[PDB]
Amino acid sequence: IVGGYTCGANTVPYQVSLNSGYHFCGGSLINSQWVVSAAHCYKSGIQVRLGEDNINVVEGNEQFISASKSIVHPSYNSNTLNNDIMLIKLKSAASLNSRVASISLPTSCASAGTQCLISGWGNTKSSGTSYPDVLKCLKAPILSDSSCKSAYPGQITSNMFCAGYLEGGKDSCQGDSGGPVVCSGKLQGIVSWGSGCAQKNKPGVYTKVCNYVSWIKQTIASN
Ligand SMILES: COC(=O)[C@H](Cc1cccc(C(=N)N)c1)[C@@H](C)NC(=O)c1ccc(-c2cccc(CN)c2)cc1
């Protein structure tokens, strides 16, 4: 997160860290055994880390659970990043409590202007690299589809939306990928891509989760 603030320990209880000996992507807990992340975060050997704040120190409240399977959307395209969503089933159910909790899926898509909270342990610099120890947060509005398509001509599909600030200085960034965009208590987006980070007229692009709610439900029901 570039230009954000320290969230405060366990104030985002649905945030997940995906770990393979180091943090590489975020995710969102949507019930006690399933996590939603981005398809381009896929790799084998994923350990899901719940209840995290400082990812480098064991502070208490962490739960480390192996992924038993990761389901990349069958139509994900790595060249366009269309359908950039993945489900991860945990080997064991998480213990839900005040510090580890799930986030609700949307019942409808959010409008332009809706304020959202984005969080993660990604890069805090738009120029070099600086990774935080603790979770960073950012409030950002959903932009209109015409401004989004003007910023990225030919690259925005109907499964994507832009959120952020066209003046630059505040954005998500590498390492935040797969993590949550929560608007009004509902998971509306997944951190997916952007051109650089926090650059002027190049906002963040996010997977539009409301287009995938019946796919998520049908897939979890059969697995
Ligand atoms: C430093 O810069 C970064 O980290 C970002 C990635 C990234 C990751 C997470 C969030 C954000 C963001 N800005 N919100 C950005 C870097 C590594 N990536 C890019 O430049 C980048 C990523 C995708 C495309 C791209 C997307 C769709 C189609 C095509 C045509 N084939 C290209 C173009 C540039």
Ligand SMILES: [Ca+2]
């Ligand atoms: Ca920790």
